[PDB]
Design an enzyme around this catalytic site. Structure first.
Site, PDB file in Angstrom:
ATOM      1  N   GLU A  20     -24.791  61.704  93.884  1.00  0.00           N
ATOM      2  CA  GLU A  20     -24.906  61.221  92.505  1.00  0.00           C
ATOM      3  C   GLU A  20     -23.769  60.227  92.336  1.00  0.00           C
ATOM      4  O   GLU A  20     -22.600  60.609  92.286  1.00  0.00           O
ATOM      5  CB  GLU A  20     -24.788  62.377  91.491  1.00  0.00           C
ATOM      6  CG  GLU A  20     -25.967  63.332  91.495  1.00  0.00           C
ATOM      7  CD  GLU A  20     -27.285  62.763  90.998  1.00  0.00           C
ATOM      8  OE1 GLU A  20     -28.338  63.322  91.371  1.00  0.00           O
ATOM      9  OE2 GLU A  20     -27.272  61.762  90.246  1.00  0.00           O
ATOM     10  N   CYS A  28     -21.466  57.335  84.497  1.00  0.00           N
ATOM     11  CA  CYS A  28     -22.329  56.697  85.488  1.00  0.00           C
ATOM     12  C   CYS A  28     -23.585  56.082  84.838  1.00  0.00           C
ATOM     13  O   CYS A  28     -24.219  55.229  85.453  1.00  0.00           O
ATOM     14  CB  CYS A  28     -22.675  57.682  86.601  1.00  0.00           C
ATOM     15  SG  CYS A  28     -21.226  58.354  87.471  1.00  0.00           S
TER      16      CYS A  28
END
Lengths: 481, 480, 481, 480
Positions: free
Chosen positions: A251, A286
């Protein structure tokens, strides 16, 4: 101010002793607020051996026992809510309102995992698909992959830990967690909770802040069956390359765009969601909305409303209830953002607001027409900076959204049925946010991306899939007397 | 000279000294075929043979069920034109529509062939709490057993295929009562099935039945499922008298369509509205009977729509360029004509058509027909479209729902929220987005709410109703 | 003994007033322990109108709101556990240990429903299966069926109510419940709990014990979209016949057999499970083990151990902690069982133990070689009576298990892989219990039967399926600009 | 005269002045075929064409992907014997086994055709908590993009089909590197694909590649997935050097089988053990290398098994009655022979075979081979079975797991608990119940644990690795 001493967790047990100390600072004041023991090479070896030894008892637990562990975590998180939120704000620098939101989402993540732990379904498959396969049937069942290596980040030190830990327990995988050295307390609080849970076998978990000298063990060690990493892209890709035989889940970062082709349901709500996307968690996410593409006909109205709303954002002490924007993780992180903002304006970008640094604080920033060659456009800024652009053609706006080496999430505001589904079809991301900014994440959704944003998906039931191995029982004439 | 047919009793062609049924050419009215009528004894024998064939049907391998369905696909392709010609002859539907029906029947049997090897079960953990420690389950689906099928006259091949193909895909024996006006399509399926060696003896019977014996298909306790497609009052009365068996009903409709935009353009929108309002001559359960057009588009749509219905070729269904064939009977046509006259008498404005010529009804458009008129409240099943104007979208949705039927609805929109608001609030089984409600894909869950029936057809959904769930609850299995 | 006065629930509100009283007796002492208002015809009409009027708000609730209702029921059941168990034993006559087991299972049922309420998935389906279907796709979603008519029994007056009520709330269906007049208090306690839940729209529920003169409204009323009945077969089949247009779900009786072909894992455990099957709830269960088939090589050993174990079963006051067998629901029910036992012995059956009546109490009974023509063999006895048989051929034992007009559940004790799967394949039931008696039910399993045992399945996710309608959105070239 | 072949570059047959690669008849050692070798520029062009074809591949209708796969099925049936003969020639496998591989390939392409129209998505509620009010999602799967395929020499048609059929079913363009010893089976698929109009230009390339350029299939960043079937050390090294792309690995095995009963009888048990131990001459990743027989059955099994081994016809693979053909090369045979001699030197008792005649290895059975011997420690990939006795079932399972591989295991048992104990505790991807571990159904999830690889093949599972999940998170969609 006496710093609080914490314990680390080695094979489910709190350890301290005469181990070296890692300092954890208050990200607002910069004072050492906590001291945590640092795990030795021998401790990591012992942690991995204990995880391997606990794998059969983890795999033998009843589904209801895995559920009971997760429900006990939910109950302890609710009971220690404010204390966990305060610790989170302190070690991460995120405003207390955002810290409380993170604790709530962590409760939801562990709750989804509790429900999923009792729902790992298998299939009964007919295998007599042709005459040569007569009398064949199969039972397809999923099994724990085995010991899991977990490496978590500093931006959501509780929730992004929960998205690895909760699925591991839901499935029955032992694990060794390396929390981020800057923010390990949220992970250590989970360790305290897990230590008091009798249903969880001895050695099922270890939570160890590790030095740079031993960090590589989490990548290369052959005893782990899976490595799951959340963090920096260059670090992540390099870990995948050197992981060896184990499965890898990543991730990584993003450079999330948003298309504004309409106001949905209205301008006020659109601006509020754009502010949230562009400046929630101070852009240290993110899925932070870094790029904003607004149609020509709406451009001046959006720019005016958006810039006016960013100018009203309260920046300061993250412990204050009315603070919207806290400091960056470090002064070095802030200096980096400031350099990219200066470079963006030097290359032709027009500064609409902000761009100034005050220690670790970066003012909420809006820059118009930043060229493709500027670092602020090409790379993940991970700061409170939004790049504003105008477009005339919708297809071209979608193409520009895709004009990045990242591919995590995208946002689109539209009242148009075909534009909504065209964007779903053509946006090169893991998630398309319709009538909200790309900064939206539901803890049950498949979360992850394409390109440099990583591989595989998190979101409890998807993360559980990567921690499970398929096994088929092929049965020849079973039930023939 | 009329062609003589056989009926199918326990997989075998039978004729003998049975009473003969005339099947007429729906265009010429000439007797084109002679069909034996099954007796009470034939129905009893058919049901006994289905009960006796149920274990061998249930014991077939998945690949054997597939091989039967693939052999049906191959025979339908081989006899394509012959089946299409027979379809036009017995149903009166234009030859282009009849070819379309044979194509959809091939797709239905093909979907069933693929589904026959995909009947999946579950492995379930059953240790959900401490008291349930050491428990696990295997959930598997089993054939329900003998199924009673009652099929209509409007799609005598495809609406038969939607019952027969799932029964074979699952492994259920069946007794089919085809419509007495259109039994030839069902009888051609019998011919095909008769030649398939993989299919156990007595797996099927196809029997045209008198009204003195038709009730057996409803009340007989040997049947585990009744699946009916046809008239609502007939269907609801069959459900009331069915006894213990499961009941699947595909009944009529009064399908509305909202035009809130032209998608992608006016020409394409008009073409889809023409298809919905007049395909199969409105003799469809998903015929677009009601058309709601937003006030800003109303005059343009009405003008284009009326001009396009005036261009529709009505005549001999055997002709390649015929769009609209005759109604199933002159009595059916007289009934439609009466409802058109009643609609105009009650205040409706006739825009085009409304005239009867034997069994032919002109493609008709009537504006502002009140709720009290039969043409508005009841299924017309003819080439009649009711046209209305609206100003508020929410109100148009409410008016679409202002019916005792609930099969399908259509909506033309470029608006994301209107599309999903209609999906949420339309009281139907299927919402067609940017096409008329007359659209059906042979794999989609098809069926409705209110008086339109209960349950769904579409191969995999029809298969579910022919399957029974069985769980194997296992206590400490794998403990040495 | 002053009887406790209860309220009935009309459109979510407690009512009593000028209404006639229904007497609820303690099934052990025969004392009137409770007084329940009897609903008038006007009350039922008002209840159904309120359910129709609440259907849009029920259908508009967020998934998390439906979950919150179910979780609040779970919390209240845990809080009032002993009180609910005591009320259950009092009105049903079931031993307190069994009553506590029923409250735990009700807690599990509402808990499964809470988890299922946030998991109603739909499908995204490709519809371009052939060239004529080019550019088509579909979204298949499930919607609440609408108002539900519920008719529940007296043998599990809390759990068998929960198996209808918990899925209705999980889906978002308003309902009108007719609890059994002999045991309505358990349903009325759920009503008290539901009344205090703010998330549940006004008129979402009504719980009314109804007189014979108005009971038919639950069957024929056209405002109900579904009738769900648990009870007597002849009553149930007749309700299905007269229900009109609505869907019907039926959970009716059984005549459950068990095959003993081995001792699994041993004789002691096999006997204990056979005792549970044959005599738990005093045989007043739709999955009571009525018929026991033991292989000839094991027969004498099983008969000896089984009869010795039934002779040890404590029969008496259901409020005693060590009572295994309480009284039958009524003296008339007990007289009926006694008549069938005498008839079984008159027709050639050999009485091994029990068979005597003491008021509403029936001794745990075992009868050997009862012929097929006897009522005890042909019909559901619903009493503490087990019919013992010997067999030499396994295939014949399976055929004899199937030699009944019921088809709910069957049991099989075997160490043989092929015998286990042969029984799964050929037993004409909804559930086959492997290495336990047929009296086993997990509240998440698909529960229901074939033949006279009913239609469709209960078990939370399966009951939810029957309260849901399928709707497809067929989309033509959506996403084409 | 050797047959001259074309290779496939961006869907087109190419030859030119490319270096020629010799393909030998594995029985006679004669050069049977001349195949062009692709250059570095060809590989670059193939990858660029695959990237350029990815949007048209992704835009194909599900029925178009199906039509391609059905056309492959029809061409494989039409050229059946020719493909089987080419397969025996280039692989050395007996003609009966070659025909079975073509059959299995037809089934693989057929499963893929049916799966291509069944790629389902989910509609998910996302309002799981109050903060998530008004949220819903549509989860859909998308082609991952260009696929790098590297196939083996042991099943050069079927193990190619297990990569190619899912890529087409999903809509992924691909570049395939067939094994240089057996490329003809892959080139016949290319010939078939070239004639299919529905397949976009540049959708496929089939390139035999030199060692100097083989690394492109591993490292090139334009590929989104690497799917490899072959040698473990080669595979693990490719995974280490793959870069950002997803990696699928189907590697070797050292498959054990437990015989705790005769199911249904001794004769059938022996036949399945013979099939497991010697099918494809042990040149299979699921070859039964280790055989554990319970002490009470040991002498009877050993006697029956050795007697049946001695009856196996070894010779010319083109002969109809040949059971065992030659090894892929004389070097492969010499390697097996060295491991057999080493096994006997370390204490193993030779019960039959063990001799080499060129590329031929006699069917071999060795008793009590110690753990330190290479024949026990490693994948033999030859007609060698290691025979062992056991007294404790739990210990036999533990010994089955006593390997660094984990592909498949077999168990013969009549015991319900032993069957499910083995399913639970065997560290493999597939447990074969009452058959040897050499069983594979082309629809089952196939793959392993430990050194046997990562992920699963079997059409629908291989399709999953070629698909990426995308969610459309919808905020208040349907609110007017």
């Amino acid at each position: 101010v006496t710093p609080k001493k914490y314990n680390i967790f080695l094979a489910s047990k709190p350890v301290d002793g005469d181990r070296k100390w890692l300092d954890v600072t208050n990200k607002y004041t910069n004072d050492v607020a906590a001291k945590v023991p640092q795990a030795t090479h021998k401790d990591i070896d012992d942690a991995i051996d204990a995880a391997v030894a606990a794998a059969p008892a983890m795999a033998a637990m009843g589904a209801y026992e895995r559920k009971a562990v997760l429900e006990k975590v939910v109950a302890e998180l609710k009971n220690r809510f404010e204390e966990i939120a305060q610790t989170l704000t302190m070690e991460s620098g995120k405003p207390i309102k955002d810290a409380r939101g993170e604790v709530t989402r962590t409760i939801d993540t562990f709750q989804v995992a509790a429900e999923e732990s009792v729902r790992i379904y298998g299939e009964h498959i007919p295998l007599d698909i042709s005459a040569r396969n007569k009398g064949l049937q199969g039972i397809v069942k999923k099994f724990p992959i085995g010991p899991v290596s977990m490496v978590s980040p500093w931006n959501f030190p509780l929730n992004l830990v929960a998205h690895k830990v909760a699925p591991a327990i839901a499935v029955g995988c032992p694990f060794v967690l390396k929390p981020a050295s800057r923010t390990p307390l949220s992970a250590l609080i989970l360790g305290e909770i897990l230590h008091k849970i009798e249903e969880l076998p001895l050695g099922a978990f270890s939570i160890l802040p590790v030095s740079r000298e031993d960090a590589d063990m989490f990548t290369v060690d052959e005893r782990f069956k899976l490595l799951t990493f959340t963090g920096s892209g260059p670090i992540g890709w390099d870990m995948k390359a050197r992981a060896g035989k184990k499965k890898v889940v990543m991730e990584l970062g993003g450079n999330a765009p948003c298309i504004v082709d309409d106001y949905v349901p209205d301008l006020d709500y659109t601006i509020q969601r754009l502010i949230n996307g562009g400046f929630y968690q101070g852009g240290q996410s993110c899925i932070h909305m870094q790029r904003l593409y607004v149609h020509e006909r709406l451009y001046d109205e959006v720019k005016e409303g958006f810039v006016a709303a960013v100018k009203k954002l309260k920046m300061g002490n993250p412990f204050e209830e009315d603070t919207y924007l806290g400091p960056m993780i470090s002064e070095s992180a802030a200096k980096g953002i400031e350099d990219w903002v200066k470079e963006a304006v030097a290359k032709g970008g027009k500064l609409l607001t902000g761009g100034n640094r005050k220690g670790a604080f970066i003012e909420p920033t809006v820059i118009e027409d930043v060229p493709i060659e500027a670092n602020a456009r090409k790379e993940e800024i991970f700061g409170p900076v939004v790049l504003l652009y105008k477009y005339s053609d919708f297809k071209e706006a979608v193409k520009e959204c895709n004009n990045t080496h990242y591919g995590l999430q995208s946002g689109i505001f539209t009242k148009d049925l075909n534009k909504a589904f065209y964007a779903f079809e053509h946006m090169e991301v893991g998630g398309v946010i319709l009538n909200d900014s790309p900064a939206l994440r539901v803890d049950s959704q498949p979360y992850g991306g394409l390109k440099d944003s990583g591989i595989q998906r998190e979101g409890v039931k998807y993360a559980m899939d990567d921690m499970l191995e398929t096994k088929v029982l092929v049965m020849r004439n079973v039930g023939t007397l």
